[PDB]
Design an enzyme around this catalytic site. Structure first.
Site, PDB file in Angstrom:
ATOM      1  N   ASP A 110      -5.928   0.711  19.462  1.00 24.33           N
ATOM      2  CA  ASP A 110      -6.942   1.719  19.750  1.00 24.33           C
ATOM      3  C   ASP A 110      -6.273   3.065  19.511  1.00 24.33           C
ATOM      4  O   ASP A 110      -5.340   3.418  20.239  1.00 24.33           O
ATOM      5  CB  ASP A 110      -7.466   1.567  21.187  1.00 24.33           C
ATOM      6  CG  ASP A 110      -8.579   2.526  21.517  1.00 24.33           C
ATOM      7  OD1 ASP A 110      -8.718   3.568  20.813  1.00 24.33           O
ATOM      8  OD2 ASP A 110      -9.328   2.222  22.490  1.00 24.33           O
ATOM      9  N   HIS A 156     -10.718   0.630  18.790  1.00 22.10           N
ATOM     10  CA  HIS A 156     -11.383   1.274  19.919  1.00 22.10           C
ATOM     11  C   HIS A 156     -12.734   0.624  20.249  1.00 22.10           C
ATOM     12  O   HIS A 156     -13.231   0.779  21.370  1.00 22.10           O
ATOM     13  CB  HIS A 156     -11.546   2.768  19.589  1.00 22.10           C
ATOM     14  CG  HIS A 156     -12.117   3.590  20.699  1.00 22.10           C
ATOM     15  ND1 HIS A 156     -11.578   3.605  21.967  1.00 22.10           N
ATOM     16  CD2 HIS A 156     -13.162   4.456  20.728  1.00 22.10           C
ATOM     17  CE1 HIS A 156     -12.282   4.419  22.737  1.00 22.10           C
ATOM     18  NE2 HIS A 156     -13.233   4.967  22.004  1.00 22.10           N
ATOM     19  N   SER A 213     -15.239   3.875  26.228  1.00 21.80           N
ATOM     20  CA  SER A 213     -14.485   5.102  25.970  1.00 21.80           C
ATOM     21  C   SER A 213     -14.704   6.071  27.121  1.00 21.80           C
ATOM     22  O   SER A 213     -14.376   5.726  28.266  1.00 21.80           O
ATOM     23  CB  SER A 213     -14.863   5.632  24.598  1.00 21.80           C
ATOM     24  OG  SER A 213     -13.888   6.579  24.175  1.00 21.80           O
TER      25      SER A 213
END
Ligand SMILES: [K+]
Ligand SMILES: [K+]
Ligand SMILES: [K+]
Ligand SMILES: [K+]
Length: 273
Positions: A171, A203, A126
């Site tokens: 995601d 995600h 991320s």
């Protein structure tokens, strides 16, 4: 030298080190665990790995034993919140690499004299995956990037570091159309790069090598064998792993060059559902 060599557990015995043992306390992050092979032939390449913002290292920890079991030292770092920006994440990763560089000279370290500190990679989840790609910009001597569902909005990705981007089709946090796909396309066209989207993946889908039914680990390891360890025997392996992995992908974009046993392959293929 085959896709069978990409098995999870690899062949080497894994041990760990941390600040509890004397490892450098890097000021730009919060805690490390170093996973390393105990019975591989020195020197070892390293990869530094960081989770997303707020998230604990346990979210990505399965990469540690995976990479180390294949001869690659892995330093997984945590974060204390500092700045909600992938650029503090890049500096954390660079500080993790400095911890690796100092570890090669640390008296009493089991890794003293055993680290190849010119073979360094970075990886992250991320905003940590945005940081990993920005770390390559800030230090273009890094040898590979593995981005896990990266988040980075306004990307300047002016680097030549071979970069593998994983993303999740589903995601919601770092949607590929706004993140991974943009990161892939703004990275220079002459930079070695590969984009792999897990069909229906959320995600967290690349937080472990088991993501994509193991495809994530197979591609990541092959990528590092080629670009971090400079082992061209894994050129054809990656190619095979990519074909084999299409069943679980919803998007693959390739733009990378690679020497196999017979010659030079410049792959620019794309797969889409
Ligand atoms: K610290
Ligand atoms: K540390
Ligand atoms: K290929
Ligand atoms: K390219």
């Amino acid at each position: 030298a085959t896709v069978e060599s990409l098995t999870n557990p690899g062949p080497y015995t894994v041990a760990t080190l941390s600040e509890a043992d004397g490892v450098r306390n890097g000021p730009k992050y919060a805690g490390s665990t170093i996973y390393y092979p105990t019975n591989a032939t020195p020197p070892y390449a390293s990869i530094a790995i960081v989770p997303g913002f707020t998230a604990a290292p346990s979210s990505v920890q399965e990469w540690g034993p995976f990479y180390a079991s294949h001869g690659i030292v892995a330093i997984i770092i945590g974060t204390n919140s500092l700045y909600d920006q992938p650029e503090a994440r890049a500096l954390a990763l660079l500080d993790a690499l400095e911890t690796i560089k100092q570890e090669n000279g640390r008296a009493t370290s089991p890794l003293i004299g055993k680290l190849d500190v010119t073979k360094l990679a970075v990886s992250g989840w991320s905003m940590g995956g945005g940081g990993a790609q920005r770390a390559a910009v800030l230090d273009n001597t890094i040898s590979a990037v593995v981005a896990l569902c990266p988040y980075l909005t306004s990307p300047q990705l002016n680097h030549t570091v071979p970069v593998l981007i994983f993303s999740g089709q589903s995601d919601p946090t770092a949607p590929p159309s706004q993140h991974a796909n943009v990161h892939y396309n703004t990275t220079p066209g002459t930079t070695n790069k590969l984009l792999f989207e897990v069909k229906n993946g959320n995600h967290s889908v690349a937080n472990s090598p088991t993501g994509g039914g193991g495809a994530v680990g197979k591609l990541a390891l092959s990528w590092l064998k080629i670009y971090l360890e400079k082992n061209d025997c894994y050129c054809s392996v990656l190619a095979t792993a990519i074909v084999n992995s299409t069943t679980v992908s919803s998007k693959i974009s390739q733009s990378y060059q690679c020497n196999n046993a017979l010659g030079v392959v410049d792959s620019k293929t794309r797969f889409n559902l």
